[PDB]
Design a protein around this nucleic acid. Sequence first.
RNA 1: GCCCGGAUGGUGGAAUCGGUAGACACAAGGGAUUAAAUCCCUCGGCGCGCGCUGUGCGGGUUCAAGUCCCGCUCCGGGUACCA
Length: 860
Amino acid sequence: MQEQYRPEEIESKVQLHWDEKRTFEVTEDESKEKYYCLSMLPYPSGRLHMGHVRNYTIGDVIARYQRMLGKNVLQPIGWDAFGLPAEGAAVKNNTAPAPWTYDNIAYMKNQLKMLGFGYDWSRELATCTPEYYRWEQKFFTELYKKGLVYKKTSAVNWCPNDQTVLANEQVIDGCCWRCDTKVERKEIPQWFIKITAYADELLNDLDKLDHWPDTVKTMQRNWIGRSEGVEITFNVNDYDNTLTVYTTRPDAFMGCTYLAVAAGHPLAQKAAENNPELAAFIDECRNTKVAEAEMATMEKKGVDTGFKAVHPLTGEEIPVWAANFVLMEYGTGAVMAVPGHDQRDYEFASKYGLNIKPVILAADGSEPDLSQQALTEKGVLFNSGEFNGLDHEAAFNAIADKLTAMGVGERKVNYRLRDWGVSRQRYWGAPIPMVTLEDGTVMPTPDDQLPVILPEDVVMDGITSPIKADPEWAKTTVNGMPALRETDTFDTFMESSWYYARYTCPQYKEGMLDSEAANYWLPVDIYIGGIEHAIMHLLYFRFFHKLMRDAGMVNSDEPAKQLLCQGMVLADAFYYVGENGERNWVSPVDAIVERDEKGRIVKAKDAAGHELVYTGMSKMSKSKNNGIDPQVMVERYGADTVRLFMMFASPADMTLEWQESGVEGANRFLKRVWKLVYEHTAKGDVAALNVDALTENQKALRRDVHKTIAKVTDDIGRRQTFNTAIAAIMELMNKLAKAPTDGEQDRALMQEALLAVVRMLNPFTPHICFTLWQELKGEGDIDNAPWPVADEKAMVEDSTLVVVQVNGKVRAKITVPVDATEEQVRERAGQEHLVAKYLDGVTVRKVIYVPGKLLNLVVG
RNA sequence: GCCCGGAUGGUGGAAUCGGUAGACACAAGGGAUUAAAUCCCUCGGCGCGCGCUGUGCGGGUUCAAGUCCCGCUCCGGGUACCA
Ligand SMILES: CC(C)C[C@H](N)C(=O)NS(=O)(=O)OC[C@H]1O[C@@H](n2cnc3c(N)ncnc32)[C@H](O)[C@@H]1O
Ligand SMILES: [Mg+2]
Ligand SMILES: [Zn+2]
């Protein structure tokens, strides 16, 4: 051991040891108890950023902690390798998506290995390889055969000039991010999976996930959006078809003063013939963006269609209006409006002079004031014919029954949850295994033809997909005749919905899963990934587990026991507009910045001379170009310092604004730990510790040692508050550095304490701890060393601290024996001069005593 | 807009079940060795071995509120084709 901590001469050395010994390679060992510690797998974007480092350090801490408790820990890594970013990058750099992606994988693989994360590299997966995607292809055809896949027309962002489809991200400030011309809605036929078929199972099973946080569970309930309501059908005067709507408020049905229909609705299209105002409005509606965000923030607009629907209970003619917020793809493409008791309908009817009829009494039984807003709260009906005086419940059922008996209403459960559209019109994805035959029929690709391989040796024009552009590729032969296979590819979430299961048997060729290996490792003990995925990915992931259960492939009903959603690591983001309207994101490293009195960024320019637009703190990613690569710091201070600093910055679940300030604190701390072990071990082998024999100074220190063990164990195992676990270990090191080390008993206690500090610090900083454990002459490699256990006898307290307050304000703090009574504490508190100061001339009215903790004398 | 979070010294954060506000660190200033590195001292505000005040803003509950309740501002995540 050298005097100086030299990370550069340790980490690479210890990393190689792990590779050669295959330390973190695991099999399905029936002797050991299993623990599956999964971190969400990275997209190979180029380099890691600190977001990645936070995810994979949290993973590694739990992986190493649980290994040290004696478990067989699976910690796998792989690459979610299909995606959009590879297409625009490959074009711009004059490559194809496949080689760009595999380069990134190698680069990042190397970064991950330099951070020292104990992965089972034997189980490494790439989702873009046909050894992987063939199985989801096979699976999709089984899903079709089971009736869980259908095709329908769906809205996509379409560039009419280029004839390309654009993702929501690629549409910016209305126009496209390439050049200046409008982006329009185009309904295009596409493949969906009936996730709504499992909506109730997905909804109900959230009540079983008591180790998933409520942030995630509540977000998921609200996303699925289960409601029990009524579908209602209206005849329309001079139109042969009917209009069907869905309401959850059939109690306010008598205050329905108009209906609102989509721009795509045939009734709107029929009326557009003779109504040029409406025809212009429908044509305008193609500019509406395919994104909920923009559709709720846009100004609510509409035109009268001229068609009058018959209200089935009053018989009154009510106008049908075409509106820009009602859409054909979702639901019936028509809704009913009750402006008196729906605020969105109130705003619409106010703007266009439509009738605002009241039908719900206020809580006191008064007719409501609808002069500033709608009465959204439920109540008794008035102005409702035979339904007057009925409360909410009875009104719901009465109107439902009457509408059912008339044969124009039916009760119905609805979900906000729409089905999962898996079609993408992009090159870099697994091809969808469906086929169109010469005779017009559509069916799954036959099993003998799976996988449908995506060619990698291609030339990209950026506009069209190589497999769509070349008409030879689609040609196959099925049932004896010519067929054309699908040129659309799968949504990239398809590969990330079952990777966790494939990790248990990645080289298995006979099927999707080896169910012996899958049932040994599943379900996942802890799943670690960003709060960004709370809804979309986690929901698909849970849905896909239920599909594989229904194929008899897995045992569990849910895929993951515990879920730890870390906060986002944020950074400042800047851009400038280019010479044809293209956003160009600049890194915060390359941006000269001038700040406010409050610390806010007020001016920003790049090194060249472009006035930058500052968008704010947002998540680190390659898209906004605001990601900080760890590679520079790792080579400066070492991986252990970078890791410790990340874990010490903030509790895992809280979102972090990244800053370089603080790294030295971790670097210095590790130098202090190194020093203390250097000095202790230079003095040689130590005597055995004599417990019953220690002085009161020695007894007190050993209490703090064993209390750190208990607290750190709880802080990692239960709370996952690693920052407080490190702070506890740091405080013990300051105690240990001030302790005497002369006597045989002092050196024996220092041994016990350092053996324990090094093990507690190992999950965080495993390289330095691997080395230090050998210097302290610990048994074996620290990776398999047992986790230290606190000793109840060493932790027993002889006194406790009581806080003394007068009318809630702290006036003194006293040490008192643990077994002390209220009367003794009062008498001891009275002896304090600052307590007596505020008891003079006043009476003690009330006393509050929290045992061993607090006394409040309520005085006046 | 809608759903979910968050805000504590110059800075990141601690306070685990409503009971000590600022643990543990960073930055800064001062001193000690001799520039680096190391080690001490000081460090929420306003006026002292004291007093008041102080956890984004406005109210309220309580013996006691960073914490609970009612109303807000700002900032982040998702909002179904970024992953
Ligand atoms: C399962 C599949 C859908 C995952 C998908 N392939 C994927 O997300 N890939 S990834 O490279 O972008 O990220 C990998 C992990 O790291 C987290 N993360 C990413 N950015 C940040 C950030 N700025 N801050 C904090 N965490 C971040 C992220 O949530 C994920 O758990
Ligand atoms: Mg602050
Ligand atoms: Zn365009």
